[PDB]
Write a protein that binds this ligand. Structure first.
Ligand SMILES: CCCCCCCCCCCCCCCCCCCC(=O)O[C@H](COC(=O)CCCCCCCCCCCCCC)COP(=O)(O)OCCN
Length: 508
C-alpha cells in the first residue's frame, strides 16, 4: 500500500533522514560514490508535489539526516576536550546539524515556492542553480562551513575530470542536475529524463583522461613529512614543549642531507616563535649546512601598528634556500580561522561559560587573504593551514603559476578515531586534482599523505603512528582551466540557469 503511504507528510520526513543519512556513505571512509546520487534523489523526489512550507521541512530533515549523520565527529572534540555535561555536548552537535540544515530547508522551500509542479525545469535548471546559491550561503554566512559537499565525493569517479575545468562546485552542480533528472524519471515513470540523466553523467567521463600538467622529472626532491603523533591533551602543555621539540628534532636529523624538503605538522612548535628563537637559529644552521630545508607550523606574536600582540597561526621556513629570520617574508599566517577552535564569537560571554569555549591557544588572528607562496630550497610552496584546504577559491587565489607543490599542515588529533580526519583528507585531495599540483599534506597524527597531481594518493603512513613519510615527489607545472578562471564561469552558468528559471516561474 505504498501508493498512499508515500503521500503522508510524516512518512516523507522519516524517509528524508534515511536518504539524508545515505549521503555520508559517499565520502572518504566509506567511499560509495553512488550513495551521493541516491541521497540527492531523495532530496528532490521527496519534495515533489508538496506545498512550499512542507518541502522546507522535508529539506530540513534531509539536511539533518546528512549533517547529524556524517558530521558528528565534532562530538569527539566536545566530549573529550571541552568540559561540559553530556547533554550539553549532544545539544551543540544537534544545534550544528540543525543550523547547517537550514540552508537545505531554505533550498527546498524556495524550490517548491517558485516551481511548484514537478518538471525538468524544477529539477535540472532550477534545483542546480538554487543548490549553488544555498550551498554558497552555507559556506559564506558566519564565516561559512562548506563541509559535506557531494562534489568532493567524486574524487575517484566518473565526474573526476570536471574539477580541473570548472572546480569542485561544478561537480555539485552536475550531481544535483543528474540526480534531479534521475528522480524525475522515477516519480513520473518516464524514460526520457533517464536518458538525459545518463548522458550528462557520461560526457564528463572522458575529461578525466586529460592532463593539464606537465610533470618535471628534474626537480624530483625527497620530501619527508614527520608525523609526531603528539597527544592533543598534552600538545600545548608547558612540560611537553621540551619533549615535543626533541621528538621532531630526533626524527629530522637522519633526514637532513638526504631530504630536500622536510615538513612538520601544524603548530609543531607549540611555543611562540619569539620565545623559541635560539632553537630555530641553531636548527637553521644545521639544516643549511647539510642542504635540507624545513617547513614548520608555529605560533607567532607579530607586533601590529597599535603595538598589540596579534597571535597568528603561521608557517616558518628554515634551512637551505630560505634563511630563517624573524622579519623574513617566507611565512604564511592562517587566514580562515576555525570557529570555536581558534576564535570565539565576541570572546566575551561564551568563553567564561565553559572550558570548551576557552581552549589552549585559541585567540588567533586572521592573516592576509592572499599571501606569497613559501620558498624552501628553491621550490615554491602554496600553503593552506588545515581548514583552509577545504576552501577551493581561497587556495586558488593564492595559487601562483610558479607554485610547485601545494602545502597543507593540519592537526586532526581532536577528532579521535572518527571519520572527521578522512572527510577533511578527501577534500584536501580535491585541491591537488583541480590545481594539478602535488599536495604535501602533513598532520600531527591524522592522514599524512603525498597527494598526486590528480587526487591520487602517492604515499601514506598509518594513522595514529609516530612515523616519517619519506618519499620522492616530482613537481608539476601547467595551469588548469579552473586555476586560470576560478569560480566565475560556474556562477555565469548559475546566473544563466537561475535567471532563465525565475522568469519562467513568474511567467505563469
Ligand atoms: C546559529 C548558529 C550558531 C553556531 C552553530 C554551531 C554550534 C556551535 C557548536 C558546534 C560547533 C563546535 C565546533 C568545535 C570545533 C573544535 C575543533 C577545532 C580544533 C582546531 O581548530 O584545530 C585546528 C585544526 O583545524 C581543523 O582540523 C579543522 C577541522 C574541520 C573543522 C572542525 C569543525 C569546525 C566546526 C565549525 C562550526 C561553524 C558553525 C558556524 C558555521 C588546529 O588546532 P591546533 O593544534 O593549532 O590548536 C589550536 C587550539 N586552539
Amino acid at each position: 500500500a505504498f501508493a498512499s503511504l508515500i503521500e503522508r507528510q510524516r512518512i516523507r520526513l522519516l524517509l528524508a533522514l534515511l536518504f539524508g543519512a545515505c549521503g555520508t556513505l559517499a565520502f572518504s571512509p566509506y567511499d560509495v560514490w553512488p550513495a551521493a546520487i541516491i541521497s540527492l534523489m531523495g532530496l528532490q523526489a521527496l519534495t515533489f508535489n508538496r506545498r512550499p512550507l512542507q518541502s522546507a521541512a522535508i529539506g530540513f530533515c534531509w539536511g539533518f539526516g546528512l549533517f547529524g549523520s556524517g558530521i558528528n565527529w565534532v562530538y569527539v572534540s566536545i566530549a573529550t576536550f571541552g568540559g561540559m555535561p553530556g547533554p550539553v555536548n549532544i545539544f551543540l552537535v544537534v544545534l550544528l546539524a540543525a543550523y547547517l540544515s537550514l540552508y537545505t530547508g531554505l533550498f527546498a522551500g524556495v524550490l517548491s515556492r517558485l516551481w511548484p509542479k514537478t518538471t525538468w525545469l524544477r529539477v535540472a535548471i532550477a534545483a542546480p542553480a538554487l543548490w549553488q546559491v544555498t550551498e554558497f550561503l552555507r559556506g559564506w554566512v558566519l564565516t561559512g562551513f562548506p563541509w559535506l559537499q557531494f562534489g568532493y565525493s567524486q574524487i575517484d569517479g566518473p565526474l573526476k575530470g570536471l574539477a580541473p575545468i570548472m572546480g569542485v562546485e561544478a561537480i555539485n552542480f552536475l550531481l544535483m542536475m543528474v540526480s534531479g533528472l534521475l528522480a524525475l524519471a522515477l516519480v513520473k515513470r518516464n524514460w526520457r529524463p533517464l536518458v538525459v540523466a545518463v548522458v550528462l553523467f557520461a560526457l564528463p567521463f572522458p575529461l578525466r583522461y586529460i592532463q593539464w600538467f606537465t610533470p618535471q622529472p628534474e626537480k624530483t626532491i625527497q620530501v619527508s613529512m614527520v608525523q609526531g603523533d603528539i597527544p592533543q591533551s598534552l600538545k600545548w602543555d608547558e612540560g611537553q614543549l621540551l619533549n615535543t621539540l626533541k621528538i621532531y628534532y630526533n626524527a629530522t636529523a637522519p633526514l637532513m642531507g638526504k631530504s630536500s624538503l622536510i615538513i612538520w605538522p601544524e603548530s609543531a612548535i607549540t611555543d611562540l616563535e619569539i620565545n623559541q628563537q635560539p632553537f630555530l637559529k641553531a636548527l637553521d644552521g644545521e639544516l643549511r649546512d647539510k642542504g635540507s630545508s624545513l617547513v614548520t607550523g608555529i605560533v607567532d606574536a607579530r607586533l601590529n601598528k597599535q603595538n598589540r600582540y596579534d597571535t597568528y597561526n603561521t608557517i616558518i621556513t628554515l634551512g637551505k634556500g630560505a634563511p630563517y629570520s624573524y622579519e623574513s617574508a617566507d611565512r604564511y599566517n592562517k587566514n580562515h580561522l576555525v570557529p570555536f577552535g581558534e576564535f570565539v564569537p565576541l570572546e566575551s560571554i561564551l568563553r567564561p561559560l565553559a572550558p570548551f569555549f576557552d581552549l589552549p591557544m585559541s585567540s588567533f588572528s586572521r592573516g592576509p587573504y592572499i599571501q606569497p607562496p613559501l620558498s624552501a630550497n628553491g621550490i615554491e610552496l602554496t600553503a593552506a593551514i588545515s581548514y583552509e584546504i577545504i576552501l577551493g577559491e581561497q587556495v586558488r587565489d593564492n595559487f601562483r603559476p610558479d607554485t610547485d607543490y601545494l602545502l597543507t599542515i593540519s592537526n586532526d588529533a581532536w577528532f579521535g578515531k572518527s571519520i572527521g580526519p578522512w572527510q577533511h583528507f578527501q577534500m584536501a585531495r580535491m585541491r591537488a586534482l583541480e590545481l594539478a599540483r602535488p599536495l604535501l599534506r602533513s598532520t600531527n597524527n591524522g592522514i599524512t599523505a603525498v597527494i598526486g597531481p590528480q587526487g591520487e594518493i602517492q604515499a601514506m603512513i598509518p594513522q595514529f603512528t609516530r612515523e616519517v613519510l619519506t618519499t620522492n615527489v616530482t613537481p608539476t607545472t601547467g595551469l588548469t582551466p579552473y586555476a586560470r578562471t576560478g569560480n566565475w564561469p560556474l556562477w555565469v552558468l548559475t546566473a544563466l540557469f537561475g535567471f532563465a528559471a525565475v522568469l519562467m516561474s513568474l511567467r505563469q
